[PDB]
Symmetry: C4
Subunit: 271 residues, 4 copies
C-alpha cells in the first residue's frame, strides 16, 4: 500500500473499465444499454409512426420496440414500416451484437483473473542453517495443481543516509540460496544466508527497527490449474522476524507408513 495524493475522465477508458467494481461495471453497461435504446427510439419517432401497433408518438412503445429489436427478441407486435424504419432496424441489430462483442471481451478480460493458491508463513525467522545465520520464510501451495518455474524475490526495504545527508528509502534484493523452483507443489522454505554480502549482515533487532526496515516477498509462477501465470506478494515488518526461531516441520509419517502434509504446523515456529 502506497497512500499519497496525486496532483495531475475518459482518458484511461480501458483500464478504468477493468478496474471498476462489478456493481459499477454492470451499471455502466446497463446505462449504456438503456441510453442507446432511447437514442434509437428517438430515431424511430423522428421518422414518425413507423412501427406497427405502436401508440402514436409514444416514446415507451418506441423504446421497448428498440430493445426487442436490438436484443433481437423480435416478438412481432411492433414491426418496422417502410424503408426508413427497417434501415434503422438492420442498423440497430448490428449495433446490438457489436455491443455484445465488446461487453463479452470486457467481461472475459475482467473475469479471467487466477490467484496463486499460495500461503505465506506469517513470520520470518533468523537462525543458523548450514553454518551461517539465515533469514527464512516459507510458502505453501494451497491447491492440488502445481506451479511451474515458480520463483521468489526477497526484498529488504530500509532507510539510508546519503553522504549529503538525504534520508531516503532504498530497496535491496537479497540473494536466496534457492530462487527458482521449476516445480512448486507443496511447501517451499526460502532462505537468504547472511554473510559479509547480505545487506543485513551483523545487524541486530535494534538496528532493523532503526532503519525502519521491512521485507517484501514476491512470488510468481505458471499455474497448471489455470494454464496461466499467477503471483502473490507479502510483506514483513522488522518485528515479524523471530530471531533464533526454527520453522516446525509439517512432514509426517502416517500410521499407514504414507508420508503426509499437516499445514496446521505451517505457521508454527519452534523457539
Amino acid at each position: 500500500s502506497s497512500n499519497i495524493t496525486r496532483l495531475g475522465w475518459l482518458d484511461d477508458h480501458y483500464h478504468d473499465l477493468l478496474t471498476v467494481s462489478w456493481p459499477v461495471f454492470i451499471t455502466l453497461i446497463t446505462g449504456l444499454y438503456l441510453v442507446t435504446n432511447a437514442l434509437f427510439a428517438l430515431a424511430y419517432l423522428a421518422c414518425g409512426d413507423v412501427i406497427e401497433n405502436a401508440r402514436p408518438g409514444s416514446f415507451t412503445d418506441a423504446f421497448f420496440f428498440s430493445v426487442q429489436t436490438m436484443a433481437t427478441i423480435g416478438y412481432g407486435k411492433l414491426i418496422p414500416i417502410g424503408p426508413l424504419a427497417n434501415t434503422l432496424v438492420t442498423l440497430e441489430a448490428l449495433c446490438g451484437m457489436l455491443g455484445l462483442a465488446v461487453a463479452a471481451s470486457l467481461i472475459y478480460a475482467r473475469f479471467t483473473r487466477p490467484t496463486a493458491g499460495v500461503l505465506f508463513s506469517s513470520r520470518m525467522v533468523i537462525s543458523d542453517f548450514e553454518g551461517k545465520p539465515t533469514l527464512m520464510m516459507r510458502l505453501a501451495n494451497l491447491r492440488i495443481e502445481q506451479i511451474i518455474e515458480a520463483d521468489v524475490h526477497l526484498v529488504l526495504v530500509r532507510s539510508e543516509i546519503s553522504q549529503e545527508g538525504m534520508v531516503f528509502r532504498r530497496f535491496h534484493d537479497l540473494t536466496l540460496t534457492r530462487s527458482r523452483s521449476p516445480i512448486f507443489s507443496l511447501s517451499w522454505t526460502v532462505m537468504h544466508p547472511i554473510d559479509h554480502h547480505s545487506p543485513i549482515y551483523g545487524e541486530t533487532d535494534e538496528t532493523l527497527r532503526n532503519s525502519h526496515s521491512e521485507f517484501l516477498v514476491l512470488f510468481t509462477g505458471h499455474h497448471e490449474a489455470f494454464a496461466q501465470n499467477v503471483h502473490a506478494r507479502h510483506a514483513y515488518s522488522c518485528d515479524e522476524i523471530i530471531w533464533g526461531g526454527h520453522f516446525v516441520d509439517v512432514f509426517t509419517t502416517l500410521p499407514d507408513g504414507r508420508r503426509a502434509l499437516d499445514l496446521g504446523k505451517f505457521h508454527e515456529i519452534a523457539q
Copy 2:
C-alpha cells in the same frame, strides 16, 4: 514408497464452498460444469417467472397465475427466441423483459469465457524416455534421458530442468528433502522438433558426483524433469513433467539411436527405438 510419482505429482497425504469460485469452475468435470450452468439457467428463469407472476397476469396468452407459462415465457424472453404468443403487457411486464434480455446476454458472456477458458487447454506432444542412463560421454560420466516431440508442429525456445531430489542432513542436524537443479550441457533448444537427449555431466560439481547405485537408494533420491516451451500448434505455451526413481537409472547404458539414413539418403525417425537402451 516414492515421494514423487512418474507423472511428476508429489505423492503425499494432505491433512486439512464459494471461496474458490473461479478455480472450481475451471476445475470441475464437464458433466458437472454443464449441470451447474443448466441449474443456474433454470433457476434464474424460475426467479424471473415469479417476478412476472408477482405483477400478475402480465403476459398475453398465459394461463392465469400459472408458473409453467410464466417460466417458458421467461426462457423465450431471456434466450430471446421471442416466439410471439406470450407477450409482455404494461410497463412492469416489459421492464422485467428488457432486464432479462440484458441478463441473458451477460450470462452468455460469462458462460462463453468459462467455456473458452476451460476449453483452450494445450498439451505438449512430448514423450519422456522411460529410463535414464549414466554413461561416459565426452570423457565424463553423464546422466541423460531424452524427449521426443510427438507432433509435426515445433516447440520454440523449449527448455528443460533436471532436478535431483534426495534426503540430507544439515550441520545443525536438520534432516530435510532438498532439491538440486543439475547443470545440463544443454538447456535451451530454440527449435525443438524431433528428439532431444538431455545431459548432466557428472563432475566434482554434480550433486551426484562419485555416487554409486547403493548411495542413491540410500538418500531415497529421485529425478524430476520439467519441460516447457511455446507450441506452434497451439500458438501458446505448453509443458510436461516426468519423474524417475533411483532404480530407473540404467548404469552403463546407452540410448539406442532412432535416427536413420534412408536408401534415398533422406534422414528418418523410427520412434520405436526411443525407449531402447543398449547395454
Copy 3:
C-alpha cells in the same frame, strides 16, 4: 534530421491487398474497421437476398421480385430477429435460411475475436522526462532521465533499458550504426509506483566516457529508452518507449524534486515539477 522520433519509432522511408489480412484488420483505425465490418455485413445480406429472389417469390408478404424486401428479410433472418411478417416458403427458401443463420453467428464469432483482439490492449501509464541531464552524482558524472507512473495502480518487476545509438567506423572502414546498452546503477525496480530516476554512471566503461556535446552531435548519436513491467491495473504486461537526441541532454542540469508537503501536511506528487531541470 533525427533517425528516431520522440515516440521511439524509427524515422525512415520504407521502399517496397489481401496479403496481410489479419495484421491489417488489427492495424486499421476504428472508423475504418467498423466500416469494413458494415460493408461486409450489408454486402453478404445483399448476396443472400439475391439467393432468395433467385428462387423467386419464396418469402411471405414480400413484394414480388423486390430486392429491398428480400434484403431486409435477409437481415431479420441473419441477425435472427425473425420478426415474422416475411417468412420462408418451401424447402429452398428455408435451407437458405438455416444457412444464413449459421453464417450470421459465425460472422459474430469472427467479429468478436477481432474486436477483442484489437480492444484488449493496456498502455503503461508511464511518462518520460522530456529531457536527459548529465551531472555529477555520487562523484561520477551521470546521465539520467526519469519515469513517472501516471496511475494509482502499481507496476511490478518493472525494468528499463538505456540504449545509446550512434555511428561508428570499423577498422575495415565500414560506417555503421551501433547500439550500446548503458549500464544503469539500477535497472530493475520490482515495485514501480510513483517516480523513478534512471542513471547511467559515466566512467571508463561508459561508451559515452570523456565525451563532450560536440562529440555526441558528431556521431549523430541518440538515446533510446525502453520501459516494461507488469501492470496491476490490467493484470497484464505493459511497456513504453522513448527516444532522446544529443540536444535533449542538458549538461550540468539537475532534475528538480516533485515531492511536496501539502498545507494539510499530507505528502504529494506534483507531476508539474517532473519536467523541470535546475541549472
Copy 4:
C-alpha cells in the same frame, strides 16, 4: 540432401481418431473446420427434430409427422430466430425447446473459442537474407546474415539464435548430430524496427574456427536461425525461423547496404538491396 529445410522444419521420414480432438480442430484447414461445424450443426438439429416428432405433432403449423418441418423448426428454435409459424405445443414440446436454446448458445460459445483460437495467430513480418556470408569485420572473420522487419510496427526485446548443426564423432566414437549455439556479437535487440545484421565472430572459440568450405560440406553442416520478439502490431509474441546449408555461405562476401539518403535528404530503406551480397 539437407537435414533441415529453409522453413526450419527438420527434413526426416518418420516411421511409426478422437484422441487429439483439440489439436485436430485447430490444425484442420478452414474448409474442413467449417464443414465439421456445419455437419455438427445439421446433425444435432436432425437429432432434435426426431425428439420433437418422437413426442408427435407438438409443433403448430407443422405437416403431421414430417421431418423437414420439424428440422427447420429445430433450427429456427436453436438459432433462436423463432419466426412464429411453427410453435411448441404442450410441456414436452417446450422443455425440448428451452433445452435446445441452451444447447444452441453453448455451441456458439464453443464455436467462438475455436474460431478465436485458430483465428488469432500473428506472424513476425520478418525476412531473412537468402544467404550468409563469411567476411572480415573488425579484424576477425565473421559469419553473418540479416533480418529485415517487413512492417511499420516494431518488435520489442527481439532476439536471435544462430545454431550450427553438424555431424561429429565422439571420443567414444558415437557418430551423432550436434547443435552448437554460436556466440553472436549481438543477440538481443530491445527495439527491432528496420534491419538487423547478425554476426558470429569466428575465433578460437567458434565451432567453425579455421574451417574451410570443404570441411563444412564434410560434416554435412547447416545453420539454423531462430528469431523471436514481441510484436507491437499484435501486442503478442512472434517468431520466425530459417535455415542455411553449407553452400549458402558466400565466403568473402559483404552484404550491400540498403540504407540511402534521398535527394530530399531524407533517410530511406531500399529492399531491393537486402539480398544483395557484394563480392
